[PDB]
Amino acid sequence: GSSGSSGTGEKPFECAECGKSFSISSQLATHQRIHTGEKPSGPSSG
Ligand SMILES: [Zn+2]
Numbered sequence: 001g002s003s004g005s006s007g008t009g010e011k012p013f014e015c016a017e018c019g020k021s022f023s024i025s026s027q028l029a030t031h032q033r034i035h036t037g038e039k040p041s042g043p044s045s046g
Contacts, residue, residue: 011021013028017035022028 009021011023013022013025015021015028015031015035017032020031022031
């Protein structure tokens with residue numbers, strides 16, 4: 001018996017920094033900005 005059905009409106013463009021979301025990329029980009037600035041690792045992802 002494994003029960004557990006729920007939903008909080010998911011999306012393809014989710015933010016794993018604060019907990020936000022968007023519909024298109026442009027929207028997500030303009031956001032990530034507030035996140036882009038620190039120095040987590042040496043070089044950049046790509
Ligand atoms: Zn965010």
